[PDB]
């Protein structure tokens, strides 16, 4: 009914991300700082020593199985168009090591998908029952990179005392991304018990194993207008279900007030 922000990312992404609300009177959300890359608010000393990068010696486009960086995940999981292979393990994804500034290859090699940023047209929109959400404004084939879960890097100890625990993503002494105060478009992606994206851990400019970056890829073909969503997991719902239950509305819903009540009658 109304387009209310032309770009919630204020030009920081490759493409604009508009906000619309055809549901209610809620204004464009602005109780956070949009950032397009992870930020630090304490001393973390991410290992950025260029000599600690594993790297390839490819003189092609890194499409061969001989690429060292592909081999760090058994193989490169990207097809020629930048999409995950059909056989990609969507239940327990591997860790992806993209090419980096120590590799011999060019910036447009075939193993550089996440570091190249957002390409699909997305929209921040008002949902009926789950606050703000994110949807597709185009068709998105299976395996396509959507966006990264960007926020503030914090320790496990800090994450355990955060008063708002709606935007915490565990990396794996685990560290966490908190997207509450600093985040990007990902902080608006809702949980779906019938999900159409999956998170994957990825390494790009550094390989400090404490700090994988979290990339979302589509787990099936997505139609224009469909809400994007992933399975937050039981490390989320085990805590949160005491405070609210799932509104995704799926017949497969495992976290509704009904599903939970039906299980409690394991009796």
């Amino acid at each position: 009914e109304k387009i209310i922000c032309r770009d919630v990312a204020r030009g920081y992404e490759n493409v604009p991300i508009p906000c619309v609300n055809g549901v209610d009177g809620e204004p464009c959300p602005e109780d956070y700082k949009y950032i397009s890359e992870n930020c630090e608010t304490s001393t973390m000393n991410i290992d950025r020593n260029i000599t600690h990068l594993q790297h390839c010696t490819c003189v092609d486009d890194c499409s061969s199985s001989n690429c060292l960086c592909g081999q760090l995940s058994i193989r490169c999981w990207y097809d020629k168009d930048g999409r995950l292979l059909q056989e990609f393990n969507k239940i327990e994804p591997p860790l992806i090591f993209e090419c980096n500034q120590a590799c011999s290859c060019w910036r447009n090699c075939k193993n550089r998908v996440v570091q190249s940023g957002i390409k699909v047209r997305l929209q921040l929109y008002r949902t009926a029952k789950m606050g703000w959400g994110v949807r597709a404004l185009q068709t998105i084939p299976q395996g396509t990179f959507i966006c990264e879960y960007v926020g503030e890097l914090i320790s496990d100890a800090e994450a355990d005392v955060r008063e708002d625990d709606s935007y915490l993503f565990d990396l794996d002494e685990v560290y966490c991304i908190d997207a509450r105060y600093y985040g990007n478009i990902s902080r608006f992606i809702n949980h779906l018990c019938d999900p159409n994206i999956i998170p994957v851990r990825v390494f790009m400019l550094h390989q400090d194993l404490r700090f994988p970056r979290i990339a979302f890829f589509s787990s099936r073909d997505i139609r224009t207008g469909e809400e994007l969503g992933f399975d937050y997991g039981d490390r989320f719902w085990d805590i949160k279900s005491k405070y609210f239950t799932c509104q995704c509305g799926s017949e497969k819903c495992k976290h509704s007030a009904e599903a939970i009540a039906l299980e409690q009658s394991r009796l």
């Binding site: 625990d165 805590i239 949160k240």
Partner: peptide, 9 residues
Amino acid sequence: TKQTARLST
């Protein structure tokens, strides 16, 4: 388990 809710891979 932990005190706060965490999304996960």
